[PDB]
């Protein structure tokens, strides 16, 4: 990809590094800046640098959508993101999610989704 | 006004007031319709004079207690909104307002519910808890939340999935409702658990020992060592009362 | 010995010598008691802090009357909101305590008479020096000064009565210019 600069010139960046994450091309929030906007506004500090080695972590919006829906027998699903393999709490506060409505419903701390067995 | 309170009134005006005062003690005048129910031999509705003894009402106007007098566990003399009475009190108690208040109970709707020794009194009181949960209007905070809490705790005390100090906790829960309400349904929901805890505490402790022996130890709230939230549910222990 | 030393080497958790080298060290030492301060590796900081077994059984500690679930209202142990007020005494309030008395030793009339007697002090009716001149012997000697007529000393919350340790139980011997106070 070639990005047009504010002074009229071109900024050639490979496609691998214009992705917002390695597992997502686009942004996941309005106020989030695209990588093209980042380079277009900060290329003076990216110029002789290696984009191979910069931080490019995976996006959770796409990893939590891979996690399958959990199913419960009732109107309530209780979520506590506990480890179950080490001592202490190590999770988020205990939350009770209503699931009577038709679709799936996510926790507010983690994005684990629950349904009413249908 | 109650149906009875107006239905009698023409007879009190015709027959002359002092007649109606000829019955009962000084401040507990008149006749009263008594519905006797439960574990009595011939369940009945009768009309007797006030301040009648309870043993007389049960033996003379009903069949007595099913299995003999000393097979009696307790009597609820004023409906669900009144604390239970133990056998020691019912032998020489009079069915009036004043005396039944003198034994920390009340004459309510004059509905006598008799309980045998073969029965589970904790099931009776937890069913009254479920009743007051279903019948709460849902307006003010303590009845709203506390009827549910009382039922959740009594469902566990039925099976013994609790501790011995949680009885005192439950008493404090009833006191969180017993005067902080708009209407008297909260008091009516607090009083029977108080009566149970006052007269039938070792039965509760025995049920909890039975659970500790037959199932396993327990923590505050009915939790066990293995109880965990696994996949949207509590899996490692019993959950009393959940039917949805 | 005394309760605080000396102590042998083999009771000190430090790595020492073995064999002929210990027999030499105890020959060539100013104090064979003394240790080479290398911790014993099998015993010191082993098991490591991140591999302790006590973490799996550790639970949050408590004390009984505060952890109780039944007879433990917070307002009976809310000591922050039961904080002591700061008392302030201007000269008006102390001539009231002097001209009149106190709730422990009242010297005030009854009814509205004492009320406006107080009110005469709340406003500048009688002054502090006037009240001191007008004050009897038994007022001053007992409510300003002590019963014996002496002034009160700068009070001490926890009085500490010192004792000097001398001789063998002291830190330094007799010659040295530092002493030991219990
Ligand atoms: C030219 C360059 C060549 C450099 C190499 C020299 C190496 C050598 O000669 O090894 C000799 C070798 C040194 O001993 P080492 O093998 O290193 O000690 C091993 C023990 O673990 C040592 O046990 P330790 O750790 O408990 O040490 C005890 C120590 C205790 O030392 C003392 O307390 C004595 C304090 C000094 C006394 C000075 C008096 C002079 O004694 C000594 O180490 C020997 C002191 C002499 O053997 C001799 O002692 C021969 C002495 C001549
Ligand atoms: C939850 C609740 C339920 C009541 N239900 C009745 C009832 O079912 N029938 C009745 O006549 N009185 C009932 N009462 C009593 C009063 O609502 C009202 O009837 C009043 O006490 C009547 O006055 P009276 O006894 O002089 O006739 C109830 C009170 C409460 C708090
Ligand atoms: S106490 Fe009475 S008013 Fe309050 S929620 Fe219960 S039924 Fe409604
Ligand atoms: Zn969650």
- List the end-to-end C-alpha distance of chain A, in Å, as a whole number: 45
Give one DSSP letter per residue of chain C, joined into a string. Answer: -BTTB---STTS-B----THHHHHHTTS-S-TT----PBPTTTTT-S-GGG-THHHH------HHHH-SSS--GGGS--STTPPP-----HHHHHHHHHS--SSS----STHHHHHHHHHHHTTSS-HHHHHHT--HHHHHHHTB-TTSPPPP---SS-----EE-GGGSSS-TTSS--EE-
**How far is CA B133 from its chain centroid?**
14
**Residue B41, annotated as binding a ligand:** no
Residue B99, token pair as written in the block = 């005396």
- Nearest CA-CA partner of B195 in B80, B74, B73, B84: B84
CA gap B201, B108 in Å, rounded: 24
**Residue B39, annotated as binding a ligand:** no
Interchain pair B242, A78: CB under 8 A: no
CA gap C180, A111 in Å, rounded: 68
CA gap B223, A69 in Å, rounded: 27
Best of B181, B184, B190 to mutate for ligand 3, by most ligand atoms within 8 A of CB?
B181
Burial tier of B51 (Cβ tally within 10 Å: 0-12, 13-18, 19+):
buried
Is the separation of the CB atoms in B126 and B192 below 8 Å? no
All residues at 6 or more sequence positions from B48 whose CB lies less than 8 Å from its CB, including other chains: B31, B32, B34, B57, B61, B95
- State the distance from the centre of ligand 3 to the C-alpha of B174, rounded, in angstroms: 14
CA gap C54, A81 in Å, rounded: 23
Q: Which residue of C has its CA nearest to B170?
A: C70
CA gap C53, C67 in Å, rounded: 26
- CA atoms within a 13 Å half-sphere pointing along the CA-CB vector of B137: 8
Is the separation of the CB atoms in B33 and B45 below 8 Å? yes
List, chain by chain if needed, residues with CB within 6 Å of any ligand 1 atom: C 17, 21, 24-25, 28-29
Long-range contacts of A16-23 (CB under 8 A, 24+ apart): A17/A51, A17/A54, A17/A56, A19/A56, A20/A59, A21/A56, A21/A57, A21/A58, A21/A59, A21/A62, A22/A56, A22/A58, A23/A58, A23/A59, A23/A62, A23/A63
Which residues on neighbouring strands pair with residue B34, listed in sequence order? Answer: B46
Which residue has its alpha carbon closest to ligand 3 atom 2? Answer: B183
CA gap C164, C182 in Å, rounded: 6
- State the distance from the centre of ligand 3 to the C-alpha of B1, rounded, in angstroms: 20
Q: Which residue of C has its CA nearest to A89?
A: C59
- Nearest CA-CA partner of B186 in B149, B155, B222: B149
Cis peptide before C47 (omega within 30 of 0): yes
C70 Cβ under 8 Å from any chain B Cβ: yes
What angle do helix axes B201-214 and B141-159 make, rounded to 10 degrees?
60
Is the separation of the CB atoms in B120 and B84 below 8 Å? no
CA angle B214, B216, B217 (to 5 degrees): 135
* Residue owning tokens 């905070």: B141
CA gap C109, C107 in Å, rounded: 7
Domain span including residue A53: 1-118
Is the separation of the CB atoms in A113 and A104 below 8 Å? yes
Pick the ligand that lies closest to the CA of residue B78.
Answer: 2
Total number of residues shown for chain C: 182
Pick the ligand that lies closest to the CA of residue B190.
Answer: 3
The full 3-state SS of chain B, as one line of letters, equals: CCHHHHHHHHHHHHHCCHHHHCCCCCCCCCEEEEEEEECECCCEEEEEECCEEHHHHHHHCCCCECCCHHHEEEEEECECCCCCEEHHHHCCCEECHHHHHHCCCCCCCCEEEEEECCCCHHHHHHHHHHHHHHHCCCCCHHHHHHHHHHHHHHHHHHHCCCCCCHHHHHHHHHHCCCCCCCCCHHHHHHHHHHHHHHHCHHHHHHHHHHHHHHCCCCCCCCCCCCCCECCCCECCCCCCCCCC
- List the end-to-end C-alpha distance of chain C, in Å, as a whole number: 20
What angle do helix axes B141-159 and B166-175 make, rounded to 10 degrees?
160
Residue C39, token pair as written in the block = 């911790």
Resolution value in angstroms: 2.7
Phi, psi torsion values for C137, nearest 5 degrees: -65, -40
Is the separation of the CB atoms in B146 and B186 below 8 Å? yes
The full 3-state SS of chain A, as one line of letters, equals: CEEECCCCCEEECCHHHCCCECCECCCCCCCCCCHHHHHHHHHHHCCCCCCCCCCCCCCHHHHCCCCCCEECCCCEEEECCCCCCCCCCCCCCCEEEECCCCCCEECCCCCCEEECCC
C139: left (phi over 0), alpha (psi -120 to 50) or beta: alpha
Method: cryo-EM
B173 Cβ under 8 Å from any chain C Cβ: no
CA gap B99, B104 in Å, rounded: 9
- List the end-to-end C-alpha distance of chain B, in Å, as a whole number: 38
CA dist list (Å): A90 to A82, B243, C48, C59 = 6, 31, 21, 14
Q: What domain count does chain A have?
A: 1
For the beta carbon of residue C86, count every other beta carbon within 10 angstroms: 5
Long-range contacts of B138-147 (CB under 8 A, 24+ apart): B139/B182, B140/B181, B140/B182, B140/B186, B142/B176, B142/B177, B142/B180, B142/B181, B142/B186, B143/B177, B143/B181, B143/B185, B143/B186, B143/B189, B146/B173, B146/B174, B146/B176, B146/B177, B146/B186, B146/B189, B147/B177, B147/B186, B147/B189
For the beta carbon of residue B56, count every other beta carbon within 10 angstroms: 12
């Amino acid at each position: 990809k070639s990005i047009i600069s504010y002074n009229g010139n071109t900024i050639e960046i490979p496609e691998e590094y214009t992705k917002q994450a390695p597992n997502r091309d686009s942004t996941w929030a309005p106020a989030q800046a695209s990588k093209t906007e980042i380079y277009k506004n900060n290329m003076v500090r990216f110029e002789q640098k290696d984009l191979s080695k910069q931080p490019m972590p995976y996006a959770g919006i796409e990893l939590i959508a891979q996690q399958p829906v959990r199913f419960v027998h009732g109107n309530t699903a209780v979520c506590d993101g506990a480890n179950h393999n080490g001592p202490g709490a190590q999770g988020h506060p205990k939350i009770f999610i209503n699931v009577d409505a038709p679709g799936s419903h996510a926790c507010q701390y983690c994005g684990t989704r629950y349904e009413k067995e249908h | 006004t109650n149906v009875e309170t107006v239905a009698v009134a023409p007879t009190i005006l015709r027959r002359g007031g002092d007649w109606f005062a000829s019955f009962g003690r000084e401040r507990n005048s008149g006749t009263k319709l008594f519905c006797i129910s439960g574990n009595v031999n011939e369940p009945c509705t009768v009309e007797e004079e006030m301040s009648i003894p309870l043993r007389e009402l049960l033996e003379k106007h009903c069949g007595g207690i099913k299995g003999g007098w000393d097979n009696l566990l307790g009597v609820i003399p004023g409906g669900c909104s009144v604390p239970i009475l133990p056998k020691n009190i019912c032998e020489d108690v009079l069915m009036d307002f004043d005396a039944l208040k003198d034994v920390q109970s009340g004459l309510g709707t004059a509905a006598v519910i008799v309980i045998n020794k073969q029965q589970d009194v904790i099931r009776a009181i937890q069913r009254f808890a479920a009743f007051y949960k279903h019948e709460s209007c849902g307006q003010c905070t303590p009845c709203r939340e506390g009827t549910t809490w009382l039922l959740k705790a009594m469902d566990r005390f039925r099976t013994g999935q609790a501790k011995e100090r949680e009885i005192d906790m439950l008493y404090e829960l009833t006191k969180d409702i017993e005067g902080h309400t708009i209407c008297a349904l909260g008091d009516a929901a607090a009083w029977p658990i108080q009566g149970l805890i006052r007269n039938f505490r070792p039965e509760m402790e025995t049920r909890m020992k039975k659970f500790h022996d037959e199932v396993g130890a327990v923590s505050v709230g009915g939790w066990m060592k293995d109880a965990r939230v696994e996949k949207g549910k509590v899996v490692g222990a019993p959950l009393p009362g959940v039917h949805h | 010995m005394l309760p605080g030393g000396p102590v042998p080497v083999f009771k000190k958790y430090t790595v020492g010598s073995k064999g002929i080298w210990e027999k030499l060290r105890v020959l060539l030492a100013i104090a064979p008691n003394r240790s080479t301060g290398n911790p014993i590796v099998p015993l010191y900081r082993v098991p490591t802090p991140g591999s302790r077994p006590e973490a799996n059984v550790y639970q949050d500690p408590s004390s009984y009357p505060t952890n109780d679930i039944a007879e433990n209202p917070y307002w009976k142990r809310d000591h922050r909101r039961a904080y002591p007020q700061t008392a302030f005494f201007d000269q008006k309030t102390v001539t009231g305590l002097l001209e009149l008395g106190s709730e422990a030793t009242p010297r005030i009339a009854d009814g509205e008479a004492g009320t406006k007697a107080l009110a005469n002090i709340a406003n500048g009716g009688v002054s502090f020096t006037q009240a001191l001149g007008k004050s009897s012997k038994d007022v001053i000697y007992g409510e300003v000064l002590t019963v014996n007529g002496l002034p009160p000393v700068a009070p001490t919350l926890a009085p500490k009565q010192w004792k000097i340790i001398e001789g063998e139980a002291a830190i330094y011997p007799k010659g040295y210019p530092c002493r030991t106070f219990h």
